[PDB]
Design a protein around this ligand. Structure first.
Ligand SMILES: Cc1cc2nc3c(=O)[nH]c(=O)nc-3n(C[C@H](O)[C@H](O)[C@H](O)COP(=O)(O)O)c2cc1C
Ligand SMILES: Cc1cc2nc3c(=O)[nH]c(=O)nc-3n(C[C@H](O)[C@H](O)[C@H](O)COP(=O)(O)O)c2cc1C
Lengths: 339, 339
């Protein structure tokens, strides 16, 4: 039983690589692993093949290696019938250091496609990248009914802010907001589906109840630090958020046609979380979630019941989500500052 | 003044390619154009370089050529200082037909990266693909304030349908719906931003007023044909839509961080179009748009003024958008059929 994987990576910092192939040779030679490692203008390409399990450890050892970064496994071939390089413990080819005409073609293509690839990667849904990082083709996965926590957040009084900031300040502000949201959601095990306007869409599993709530609090908290970090001429000092969470059945998977695919979550919980985010504009709290979310949590939160809003939904929060301000006073305090 | 471009394509049908390189040699040799064309397992890679304008025609001639399809230009280099293949009218290399060990590595990589590339392409926003298809890096474009028509459509009584169809029928239905929407929007010059649940988001320019309205009508019409095409056991016979259009300033461009980017439209018109789509559930029409959309149209539509809904917005339709049914009678006619 043998398997084969392939990945691409980026070097972590700046002919320093002659000796690292002069480590791979020895330890692959010991587990009957073969494979190739290419190098071209800041980028790494490796193929690894051997019996399914001792292949898997070194790849974990490679994952945590200080000198490359941004690792993504493209293909996995399970129970391969025979090897692609039966004689190569680890063949190392520095494609930068070849000056023959006949190879410059393929060398330039390989460079252009993978640089393109790396840009496209940044626009993928987290979940599609994750599937590719196992050996699963996202255009062949059947979508599945699953129980998820759905997350939405967007910028408060953002219509006021688009009306009275120049375009280039708006973009600086929205990028900052997206990068803080994405960093914290990811750190806690969740996945960003997409951005919809100033809106961040994300989801967590039913086991990540407390992490979805911690995520929400850490985002609210980081905006608070940021607001007093900057000067009053910086649009960042007027940046506030509201967050809605919900929990339910959703159908998750890749959908559409061969003109266009997207990663999509179908089911009513998606709409519910969006309306709780909207609702926070009229509550003295910045986070609102359903009862189903409350029941997914193991930590000992102080829950606060906010009655039924709309068929009805019971709405809840935690008191650490309490505001130190009044929402109307700030949405018109944003208007006054902006003149 | 010379320029260079590179693209990848897919063959349109199934050693039939020896003579097509035996046409390129002669006509490139006549305009002082050089370049490379590779072939590998169903895929084409070409590089073209010459003085900026007579490069551009043959590439248009290539675009309309019967035997490859799915053409995407990755890179463009304007006013290149000197050529990459100074001596090659058109070098043709069938990478399938080489059986040397030392090249199989790079050949297998090139295959894996570009096959991966082709899947990622299907998940991109139309507008990011379009930029790449010119020579513009989407991670370097500054976003721009622009006047757009915003389009939203989603499935009527979809919550009833998710509650009472099996997951695999839901997916068949949603895929059908997305592929009809995407085909018609594209045919008419618009671009799909993303899918949000059962929702299709798209936009048109201010010059495409009548095309956004024709798009909406052609989608409604195709669902009507489809409903009487199929049997009553097919979920497709219960598939209806509502469509909202709006027009306003939006900031359009690539935003986020290096963890995640998305193609995004900021501004209040986005929210407005979503609420008009929602509003159609209570109107005897399936399409609703603002006054600003009405003013973008040159054709001689019969407009119907639907009063103000919400600051107020005047709502409009055309009478070809008139329903032959009652929306509540059908949303509960969908419930009865489904038992
Ligand atoms: C791109 C890349 C590929 C690598 N491939 C291998 C490999 O195939 N086999 C291996 O043993 N180490 C490989 N390494 C490095 C290992 O992590 C190396 O064994 C480590 O630096 C030291 O091993 P040790 O600490 O267990 O003694 C690779 C590193 C990089 C950056
Ligand atoms: C992948 C691909 C690359 C091509 N590259 C060229 C080219 O570089 N130069 C060229 O003249 N024709 C190229 N062709 C085909 C042209 O369209 C060809 O000139 C056409 O079939 C007949 O030309 P004509 O009808 O003007 O006589 C290419 C076709 C394909 C599928």
């Amino acid at each position: 039983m043998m398997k084969r994987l392939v990945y691409i990576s980026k070097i972590s910092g700046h002919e320093e690589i002659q000796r690292i192939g002069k480590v791979s040779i020895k330890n692959n030679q010991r587990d009957n692993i073969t494979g190739v490692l290419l190098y071209l203008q800041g980028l790494f390409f490796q193929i690894l093949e051997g019996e399914n399990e001792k292949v898997d450890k070194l790849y974990k050892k490679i994952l945590v290696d200080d000198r490359h970064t941004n690792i993504l496994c493209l293909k996995t071939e399970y129970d391969i019938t025979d090897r692609m390089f039966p004689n190569w413990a680890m063949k190392t080819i520095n494609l930068n250091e070849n000056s023959e005409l006949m190879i410059q073609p393929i060398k330039s293509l390989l460079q252009t496609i993978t640089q393109s690839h790396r840009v496209l990667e940044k626009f993928m849904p987290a979940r599609v990248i994750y599937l590719i990082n196992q050996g699963i083709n996202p255009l062949t996965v059947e979508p599945q009914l699953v129980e998820k926590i759905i997350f939405f957040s967007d910028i408060l009084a953002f219509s006021t802010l688009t009306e009275k900031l120049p375009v280039n300040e708006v973009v600086i502000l929205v990028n900052r907001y997206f990068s803080i949201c994405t960093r914290i959601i990811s750190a806690y095990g969740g996945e960003v589906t997409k951005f919809i306007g100033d809106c961040v869409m994300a989801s967590f599993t039913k086991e990540q109840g407390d992490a979805a709530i911690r995520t929400s609090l850490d985002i609210i908290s980081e905006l608070k630090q940021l607001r007093h970090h900057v000067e009053a001429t910086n649009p960042l000092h007027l940046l506030y958020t509201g967050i809605g969470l919900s929990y339910g059945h959703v159908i998750e998977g890749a959908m559409g046609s061969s003109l266009k695919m997207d990663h999509t979550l179908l089911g009513d919980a998606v709409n519910v979380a969006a309306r709780l985010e909207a609702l926070t504009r009229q509550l003295p709290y910045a986070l609102a979630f359903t009862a189903g979310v409350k029941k997914c949590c193991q930590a000992q939160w102080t829950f606060i019941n906010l009655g039924a809003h709309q068929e009805a939904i019971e709405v809840y929060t935690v008191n650490e989500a309490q505001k130190y301000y009044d929402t109307l006073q700030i949405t018109q305090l944003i208007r006054q500052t902006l003149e």
